[PDB]
Amino acid sequence: NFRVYYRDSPVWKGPAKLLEKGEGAVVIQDNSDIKVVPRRKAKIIRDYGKQ
Amino acid sequence: SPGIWQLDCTHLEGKVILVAVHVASGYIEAEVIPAETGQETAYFLLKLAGRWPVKTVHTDNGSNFTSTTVKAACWWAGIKQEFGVIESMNKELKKIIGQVRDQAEHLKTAVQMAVFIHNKKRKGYSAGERIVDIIATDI
Amino acid sequence: SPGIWQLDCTHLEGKVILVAVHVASGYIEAEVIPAETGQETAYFLLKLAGRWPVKTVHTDNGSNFTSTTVKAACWWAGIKQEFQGVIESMNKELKKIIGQVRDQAEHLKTAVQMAVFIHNKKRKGYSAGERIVDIIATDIQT
């Protein structure tokens, strides 16, 4: 339902699987790697045109 | 299919022209973007998606169409991406642009005049009439 | 009437938002213009006119809508200008949806087009985008 786009360290990377959303960070899986990204550096985008 | 679109960029006078075509009707939308980037391409798709039932967009492997910014726009708007109707349409667009180029100072004005002429020319319906007919029939 | 539109400008974050609304359907188009000038208004109308059967546009007495450059665009595209308050209620509706989704995007122009998407696709029954296509195609097919 959701997809997460994020920046490490400038170019936006993604889409990545959303595993968990916290108060100050989000846990995602981009390909085969699990990453912990701060909220300010991640965009969680819902598929709105579908549903 | 009423929801199939083709997007590609063409260039004139050193400027970038992003052209979208409704394949089933030949209706076109065009915009002069300040840079051929994924951010400008994604912003173009958002405007297109909120306007027509955009289900599938077919582009080449340009770095602006394969960018992450476009993937987020297509995902949010519910658009599927696939990687010569648009290329033949760019030739038609540049033809009409040259016919009206001297009538305006800015290239972007001649572009929108050319899109106007294309979408309103009958044969019989015009391209602008066909896309509205096709989409309303699908509803 | 399928060819009546209303255009007006609203402001958010110091930027100018030019909004066009199809009165019969409530369908809207919006674009962030770099300046509230007649040249940007006329370029917006050309894009609008080559897209829908734009026959009459209702605006206020702003110096950008009464400019000569807009008159030339309307004459070339065959548009008549007139100077229910649909656009004023629509500016509130657009800015309402913009504020609801503003944090989802960096650029204001992105939130603008998301809000236009949300408005034209919302069912409450046809949607705004479905009504304008239904109204215009009915006039074409008949």
Add this chain to the structure above:
Amino acid sequence: QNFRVYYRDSPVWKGPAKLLEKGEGAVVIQDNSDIKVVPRRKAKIIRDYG
């Protein structure tokens, strides 16, 4: 039916004006009841489309 010409001769674009002739460097127009000669670069000749 015919054409309209928009022109500047001091600021704000003036017109529409009747088109009489288009030259290499000037255009002969009639704005209302007055005959004017305007350079090409200060005149927009727009064909009646739509």
